[PDB]
Nucleic acid binder design. Sequence first.
RNA 1: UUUCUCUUUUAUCUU
Lengths: 309, 321, 311, 21, 20, 19
Amino acid sequence: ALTRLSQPGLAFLKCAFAPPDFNTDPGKGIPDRFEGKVVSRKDVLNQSISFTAGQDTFILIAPTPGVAYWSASVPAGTFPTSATTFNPVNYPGFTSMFGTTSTSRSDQVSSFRYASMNVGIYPTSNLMQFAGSITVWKCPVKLSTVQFPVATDPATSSLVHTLVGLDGVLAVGPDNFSESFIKGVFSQSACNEPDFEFNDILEGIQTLPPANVSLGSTGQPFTMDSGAEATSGVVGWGNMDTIVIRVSAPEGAVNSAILKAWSCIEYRPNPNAMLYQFGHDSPPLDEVALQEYRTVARSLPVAVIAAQN
Amino acid sequence: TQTAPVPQQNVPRLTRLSQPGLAFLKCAFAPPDFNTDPGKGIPDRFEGKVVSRKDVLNQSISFTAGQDTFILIAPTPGVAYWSASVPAGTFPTSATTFNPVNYPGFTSMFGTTSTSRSDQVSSFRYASMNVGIYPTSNLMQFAGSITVWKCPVKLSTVQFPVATDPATSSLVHTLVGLDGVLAVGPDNFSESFIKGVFSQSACNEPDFEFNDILEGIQTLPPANVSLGSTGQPFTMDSGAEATSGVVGWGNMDTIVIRVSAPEGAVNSAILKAWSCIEYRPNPNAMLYQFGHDSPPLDEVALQEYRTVARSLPVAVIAAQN
Amino acid sequence: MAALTRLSQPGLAFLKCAFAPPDFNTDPGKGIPDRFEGKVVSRKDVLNQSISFTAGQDTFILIAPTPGVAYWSASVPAGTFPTSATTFNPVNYPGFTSMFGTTSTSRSDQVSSFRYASMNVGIYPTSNLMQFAGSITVWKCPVKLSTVQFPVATDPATSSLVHTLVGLDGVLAVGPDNFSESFIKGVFSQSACNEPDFEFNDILEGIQTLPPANVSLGSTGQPFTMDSGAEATSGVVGWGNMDTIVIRVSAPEGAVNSAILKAWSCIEYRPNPNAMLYQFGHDSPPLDEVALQEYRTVARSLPVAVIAAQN
Amino acid sequence: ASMWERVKSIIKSSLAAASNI
Amino acid sequence: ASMWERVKSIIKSSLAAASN
Amino acid sequence: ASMWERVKSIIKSSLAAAS
RNA sequence: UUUCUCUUUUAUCUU
Ligand SMILES: [Ca+2]
Ligand SMILES: [Ca+2]
Ligand SMILES: [Ca+2]
Ligand SMILES: [Ca+2]
Ligand SMILES: [Cl-]
């Protein structure tokens, strides 16, 4: 029955929903009509992470190229507030792809499309010390814009990037996975569009809201700060819903784990980049794979415990 | 003849419609014909979480005699239509400003601040946009016409320099395609006002991609920008941020209706506006518990949609809505 | 055969305007055979230009998805590539102004949006065997029109957001996938949709240069500059979804390289009801699965470019 | 439904002109 | 049921229920 | 060979693995 | 774009 899928169509499905179940080469690209030259970046992160007791740590797996996730901790029982700032944890090689200044992001690649985005949390604490839970839900966060006037001379109108839908992080979504911390979790996101469109690499974005822009004039409930341009940045926003994970560690809890993140991304390489050497045509259309992708995604649970990744 | 060729390397070598698909075609082309909104979502590839809102507006309205009133059914979520009137025989000028009439519950969906627009939903996509005008005037008091045509209005951007200190460059939203309102489109419906009218728009893109919610827009041209800078033929002013605003611009052509009341004409009617929209709910919204998944791809429906849309007349009299 | 008969008429024509335009008495082109069947105006732009290349210099030509403009060029010192000191100037298809007006803010007066079907180019040497010298190298770049965000210390302090061409850096090196041959053999090349589907792009208003006025090249990330010149003669009215064809014509000191340059563009525009242009419109052709598939296949199966003797 | 019937007519008119393989 | 297993069954189950 | 012929070949070669 | 064998040599899918 799985023979009705093309070789790539099948590989595609694997990178998409179960990258941890395979030893290597999960996918060769997206089996959609597009067959232009691309480079399949297999992003994988292995981050050891300890959650501070009395704090509810929030992790966001966003479709931001090169950056595995963003996080911030808040007092137990609370959510991110205007006072919160999320900080990123990069995938190995961020600068090897996006440079060291906020304006050299499109040097290697010019655009991209996410094929998969998965995350797993594997508890490493003992059974007598942990406590708390892991809660997961997904938010339709998009990168839009905000229009406002500034009293400069002459008076002018500003237009800047702004993240819409972040408000979804301020409450546990009705569709969610919630279970004991010790059981860990595995979850994946899916394309939030009727198809896989390419998005452009974005230059100069180091923070949202931007420098010289006040939160609140943006509408965002909190801040995204990538930090030093020489180490990280927001080079784009893919069409995938954001995975929100809330690990709540009670006072006295000793919760630690190993976090793993996977991202299959098709990048359009520039001829002057060495990355181009590894390009190839995106796989041909595989109507069956594209249809099963949608079915499988809709059929799976929000998340599953670690042991079932 | 004695020049060796340069080596070249790396050279290439009887199906029927689903329930949601049928319902999709009903919300799309004939909403007044059903006891209930038949709509259920867009039967395209996408099957993620959405909330289907069926917006309907009932507006009793009177047209100023000696005026040519212009109504714009645009893909602006929450806002039924935009209106403005000019002296009979003329079209909107730079001196003109359109004002929005909200669908019921605008604030419940988009807040009361120009930066609260994406608090409930983050993005959207139109499934349908219909409009109808039902004359209520007696036979001897009315006079005039109703004319309809459709415009490919898109929300683009304009780039111009500003002599601030230091010198700066501005980039702001700007509606392209508005110039199409300054003349009656060759493809149009035109008939006695009393006969009323019913018309519908359709996706102006090869597919139903999601558009994002836009924060801060209250006017176009925006504050501190001259109409000259934008290239727009006129102005769109949504007014008080606590009552309305421009939360987004969908992928549907804009319906332009021009009601012509000559001098001494008593032209009264009821205007209805339908709008089937699929929104992406925010987990925190109270709106979310009403959500479901967009319906599965239904090839037949997606092709019938395009065929039907192309086969229908620009508009029809109210008697055949 | 039973391969070219499964295609709808428009589908067949689509494949032709797309891959081999010189081969016809008339452009078969009639629109894109995809789901979209709304009102459009199909325009097949063709540029014919006798051109003579500057000896001792490498001339760079860019066939970009910029409506109304055939190509952008700039010449640099032999053996070098465009630098921050370089500026490209657009060469327009006939009737630019009748399509996009004469001021940077009247670009959306006739049409509001567009989408490319094809974009081809050809160079036909006209030099004799005693005067030509040099080479023609072609490769393609995935150049897109994005944006850059940066702070400006005005009073009060503010944040700017402006257009930036992303992936322009690809022009500074001849990628491993290229066509390279003696000038005398000429060349023919085409570009294809760099997206999985043919979506419409909006007409852009007010763009005369990139980086725009009052913005330093440095803050945009672009490796060089794009200057359309007088708003009354040219400008960038949009950026389509086709990859950019880069061509490097290198002429040695003392060589006479003359040629005829041709450029084709099959574009589908959304006409404005008020435009005079509209009376020429029709509905975009209906979906033709076969054609949409052959397109993709043929596209990735064709070489970067071929010598002129075969177009 | 002089509009829904107009649509049903178009649907069967094309679903029939394309069912004669 | 590893994720892949859970997925394969959904596919086979889908491809089968669609052969009716 | 011609360009339309080079293309007419790629169409009939791939439409050969389709039937 | 052209024709097969042969070993390749990986790579999935099935017991
Ligand atoms: Ca908000
Ligand atoms: Ca799309
Ligand atoms: Ca204008
Ligand atoms: Ca750069
Ligand atoms: Cl000439």
